[PDB]
Amino acid sequence: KPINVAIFGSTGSIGTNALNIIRECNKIENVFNVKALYVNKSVNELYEQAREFLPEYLCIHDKSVYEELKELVKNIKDYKPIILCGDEGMKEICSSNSIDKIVIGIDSFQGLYSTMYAIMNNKIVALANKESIVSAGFFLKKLLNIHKNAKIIPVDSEHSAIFQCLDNNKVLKTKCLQDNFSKINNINKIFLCSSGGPFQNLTMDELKNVTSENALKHPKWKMGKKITIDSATMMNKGLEVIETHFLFDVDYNDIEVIVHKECIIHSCVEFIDKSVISQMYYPDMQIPILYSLTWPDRIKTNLKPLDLAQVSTLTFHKPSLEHFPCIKLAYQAGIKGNFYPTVLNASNEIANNLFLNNKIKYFDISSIISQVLESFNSQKVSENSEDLMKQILQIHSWAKDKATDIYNKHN
C-alpha cells in the first residue's frame, strides 16, 4: 500500500525537508514512492534528486533548461522517466492516476496555480504555501466543494499542530476549508503560537531604525528571506491568522496569537468544554510534512525523542500590537473579508521586498499596507469560479501596483 507522492518545489526548503523525511522513513520500511518532482529552474539539483528517487515524472518550469535536463538524465542507467516542462507538464502530473498526494512547496503567488490544479484532479494537497489560502481562501472553498474528493492537508507548522490535535472521527465528517469545520470538531478557540522573530524585545525607537540585515540574523529557523522578513514584522503570524480562519472556520475573535520563544508547543486547540490540546516537538518541518502524507495514520520515525526535562522551561506572552502593527492589519483585513486578505497579501509582498532591499523602514511596511487596504473597495464576489479567479488576479495585481505607487509618491 505505498504512498504515491509528488513533490512540487522539490529543491526548496519545504521540498528538501519533504524528501529528507521520506528518505529517512523509507530506510525503516518502504512506504513512499516519489512519483514526480517539479521545480522552476534548479536543473542540476533536480538531476541529483532524480538520480536518488528515480521518479516516474520529472518537470521543470523554465523551458530554457528543459533540453539540459533531458541530457543530464541520460546519464542515469536503466531510467526512462517522463520528462515534462511548464504549466503543461504540471497539469499532466496532476492528472496522473498514479499520484495520490502532492506536496506544495512552491512559494509566493505562483503556488496558488498548482494548488488549484491539484485540487481539480481530486488529490490530497499537502499545502505549505499559506499565501495561496490568504489570497484565494473563498475561491479554494468553492473549488473544494466542486472537487469533493480533493483535500487540503495543512503543512504550515502551527496549522499542522492544530490539525494533529483533532479527533479524526470528526475530521472525516468534514475537511479543511469547509464551513462548519470548527463546529463539527467542537473547536472553541485557537492559540496560534509564534517564535516572535528577532525583534521581539526591541523598543519602538529601536524598531524605527532596524534593517533587513538585522531581520535576517540566524532566527530559530533558517528559511528564505521573504518568510524571514515576515517573521520579523510578525506579518507571518498575521497571514497565519487568516490561514487559521480559512482552514478551520474559526472566527477571528477566537484566534489568539501567543509568543512562545522556545518553539516547542506549536499551537493549541481549545474545545467547547474548555479542554485544551496542543502539539509539541522540537522545531522541525519534517513532522508537519510527514503527518500531511500519512494522515489519518502515523508511521515510525527515527527522530530524536523530545526531552521535556532537558527543555525545562516553556514561556508564553502576548505580542505587542504597537510594536507589531502588521498583526492588527491582518486581523482587520480578515474581519472585513471580501478580497481584503488578497489585498493584504499583495501589498505585503511589495512592502516586504522594499524593506528587504533597504528602500523603506520597518514602520513603513505597515504604513504602506494600511494605505493600500484603505484604498480598496469591496467587490461583488463572482459566483463563476473562472471569473472569481480573474478577480483575485486583478485585485492582487492592483494591490501590488498601489503599494508601489504609495512608496514612489512618498519617496
Binding-site residue ranges for 1-deoxy-D-xylulose 5-phosphate:
130, 157-158, 195, 218, 231, 236-237, 240
Number of residues that bind Mn ion (CB under 5 A): 3
- Residue nearest Mn ion, CB atom distance: 156
Residues near 308 by Cβ (< 8 Å), separated by ≥ 6? Answer: none
Q: How far is the CB of 87 from ligand UW0 (least distance, A)?
A: 27
Q: Nearest 5°: CA angle at 349, between 344 and 354?
A: 120
Q: How far is the CB of 263 from ligand UW0 (least distance, A)?
A: 4
Name the E strands within 105-260: 124-127, 151-154, 187-194, 255-259
Binders in 351-380 for Mn ion, by CB under 5 A = none
User: Given the rule CB under 5 A, which residues bind Ca ion?
Assistant: 64, 167, 254
Interface residue with a second copy among 290, 346, 389, 392 (CB under 8 A) is 290
Largest pairwise CA distance in the chain: 63
How far is 37 from 64, CA to CA, in rounded Å? 18
Q: Does 382 bind a second copy (CB under 8 A)?
A: no
**13: partner contacted, choices ligand NDP, ligand UW0, Mn ion, none (Cβ within 5-8 A by kind):** ligand NDP
Q: Nearest 5°: CA angle at 238, between 184 and 137?
A: 50
Q: Does 1 bind a second copy (CB under 8 A)?
A: no
Q: What is each CA distance from 373 to 261, 345, 410, in whole angstroms?
A: 31, 10, 17
**119: partner contacted, choices ligand NDP, Mn ion, Ca ion, none (Cβ within 5-8 A by kind):** none
Q: Does 38 bind ligand NDP (CB under 6 A)?
A: yes
> Beta strand 187-194 with 265-271: parallel, antiparallel or unpaired?
antiparallel
Interface residue with a second copy among 61, 123, 189, 400 (CB under 8 A) is 189
How far is 153 from 261, CA to CA, in rounded Å? 26
Quote the distance between the C-alpha of residue 216 and its chain's center.
Answer: 20
Q: Is 192 helix (H, G, I), strand (E, B) or coil?
A: strand
How far is 401 from 173, CA to CA, in rounded Å? 42
The DSSP string of 41-79 is S-HHHHHHHHHHH--SEEEES-GGGHHHHHHHHTTSTT-
Binders in 253-282 for a second copy, by CB under 8 A = 258, 265, 268, 270-281
Q: Does 156 bind Mn ion (CB under 5 A)?
A: yes
Beta carbon nearer to ligand NDP, 40 or 200: 40
Interface residue with a second copy among 82, 83, 299, 381 (CB under 8 A) is 299
Q: How far is the CB of 376 from ligand UW0 (least distance, A)?
A: 25
Q: How far is the CB of 154 from a second copy (least distance, A)?
A: 14
Q: Does 318 bind a second copy (CB under 8 A)?
A: yes
User: Given the rule CB under 6 A, which residues bind ligand UW0?
Assistant: 156-158, 194-195, 197, 220-221, 227, 231, 236-237, 263, 266, 283-285, 288
How far is 130 from 71, CA to CA, in rounded Å? 35
* C-alpha grid cell, residue 82: 517522463
Beta carbon nearer to a second copy, 40 or 294: 294
Q: Nearest 5°: CA angle at 94, between 90 and 95?
A: 115
How far is 64 from 163, CA to CA, in rounded Å? 40
DSSP 8-state symbol, 317: B
Q: Does 287 bind a second copy (CB under 8 A)?
A: yes
CA dihedral 217, 223, 224, 228 (to 10 degrees): -50
Interface residue with ligand NDP among 35, 61, 189, 266 (CB under 6 A) is 61
**156: partner contacted, choices Ca ion, a second copy, ligand NDP, none (Cβ within 5-8 A by kind):** ligand NDP
Under a CB-based contact definition with an 8 Å cutoff, are residues 164 and 280 in contact? no
Q: Does 197 bind ligand NDP (CB under 6 A)?
A: no
Q: How far is the CB of 288 from ligand UW0 (least distance, A)?
A: 6
Q: What is each CA distance from 245 to 10, 111, 288, in whole angstroms?
A: 28, 20, 19
Beta carbon nearer to ligand NDP, 143 or 239: 239
Q: How far is the CB of 220 from Mn ion (least distance, A)?
A: 11
Q: How far is the CB of 189 from a second copy (least distance, A)?
A: 7
DSSP 8-state symbol, 270: E
- Residue nearest ligand UW0, CB atom distance: 157
Beta carbon nearer to Mn ion, 3 or 193: 193
Residues that bind a second copy (CB under 8 A): 164-170, 172, 186, 188-189, 191, 258, 265, 268, 270-281, 287, 290-291, 294, 296-301, 303-306, 308-309, 311-318
